[PDB]
Amino acid sequence: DYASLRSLVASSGTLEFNNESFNWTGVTQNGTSSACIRRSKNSFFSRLNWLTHLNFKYPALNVTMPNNEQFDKLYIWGVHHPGTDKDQIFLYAQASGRITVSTKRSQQTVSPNIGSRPRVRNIPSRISIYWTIVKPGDILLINSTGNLIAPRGY
């Protein structure tokens, strides 16, 4: 639904990003890629966090972030579909899970699918980006068993 996200952000008219500090205990933060070169260093999207395995252990991620301010918040989250199974073991250290983001009303469940795709910039894997809007009273919860491109803020 690329058109919907584009029209939404354009209508809002601000790219203002407030950084937030989530739990993220037990997983390796940041993350790098060869295609996303930034200042001659391998890198990733500025507003996205590539979570990877820590000590070959990926605990279930149950991270809650509330809204106490009086404005609606837009969260950008993603699911990483790996090209190969070798890569899944290398990066997340377990099998494919399910990524579910949830609020009082909206709940989105995406299942990673591992398969080779036409290589773009020599990268066979892909990432699917979704958006979640959190109301003031509502709270955001994620159940990640891997393959989660987590938000860095709102």
Ligand X SMILES: *[C@@H]1O[C@H](CO)[C@@H](O[C@@H]2O[C@H](CO)[C@@H](O[C@@H]3O[C@H](CO[C@H]4O[C@H](CO)[C@@H](O)[C@H](O)[C@@H]4O)[C@@H](O)[C@H](O[C@H]4O[C@H](CO)[C@@H](O)[C@H](O)[C@@H]4O)[C@@H]3O)[C@H](O)[C@H]2NC(C)=O)[C@H](O)[C@H]1NC(C)=O
Ligand Y SMILES: *[C@@H]1O[C@H](CO)[C@@H](O[C@@H]2O[C@H](CO)[C@@H](O[C@@H]3O[C@H](CO)[C@@H](O)[C@H](O[C@H]4O[C@H](CO)[C@@H](O)[C@H](O)[C@@H]4O)[C@@H]3O)[C@H](O)[C@H]2NC(C)=O)[C@H](O)[C@H]1NC(C)=O
Ligand Z SMILES: *[C@@H]1O[C@H](CO)[C@@H](O[C@@H]2O[C@H](CO)[C@@H](O[C@@H]3O[C@H](CO[C@H]4O[C@H](CO[C@H]5O[C@H](CO)[C@@H](O)[C@H](O)[C@@H]5O)[C@@H](O)[C@H](O[C@H]5O[C@H](CO)[C@@H](O)[C@H](O)[C@@H]5O)[C@@H]4O)[C@@H](O)[C@H](O[C@H]4O[C@H](CO)[C@@H](O)[C@H](O)[C@@H]4O)[C@@H]3O)[C@H](O)[C@H]2NC(C)=O)[C@H](O)[C@H]1NC(C)=O
Tell me the β-bridge partners of 27. Answer: 53
Q: Is residue 107 involved in binding ligand Z (CB under 6 A)?
A: no
**Tokens standing for residue 3:** 């058109």
Q: Which is nearer to other proteins, 12 or 113 (CB)?
A: 113
The answer to whether residues 112 and 99 touch, using CB atoms and an 8 Å cutoff, is yes
Rounded to an integer, what distance in angstroms lies between the CA atom of residue 142 and that of residue 13?
27
| CB-count exposure of residue 75 (10 Å: 0-12, 13-18, 19+) | buried
Measuring CA to CA, which residue among 108, 14, 20 is closest to residue 68?
A: 20
Say which entry of other proteins, ligand Y, a copy of itself, none residue 109 contacts (CB below 5 to 8 A, set by partner kind): a copy of itself
Tell me, residue by residue from 101 to 130, as one string, x for binding to ligand Y by CB under 6 A and - for no binding: ------------------------------
Q: Is residue 23 involved in binding ligand Z (CB under 6 A)?
A: yes
Q: Which of 49, 52, 125, 144 binds other proteins (CB under 8 A)?
A: 125
150 residue type, one letter: A
Say which entry of ligand X, other proteins, ligand Z, none residue 62 contacts (CB below 5 to 8 A, set by partner kind): ligand X
What count of residues does the chain have? 154
Q: Is residue 30 involved in binding ligand Y (CB under 6 A)?
A: yes
Binders of ligand Y among residues 47 to 106 (CB under 6 A) are none
The answer to whether residues 96 and 63 touch, using CB atoms and an 8 Å cutoff, is no
- Phi-psi category of 146—alpha, beta or left, where left has phi over 0 and alpha has psi -120 to 50? left
Catalog residues that contact ligand X under the rule CB under 6 A.
Answer: 60, 62, 64, 114-116, 119, 122, 124, 141, 143, 145
The residues binding ligand Y (CB under 6 A) are: 19, 28-30
The residues binding a copy of itself (CB under 8 A) are: 62, 64, 98, 100, 102-104, 107, 109, 113, 115-118, 120, 126, 138-141, 143
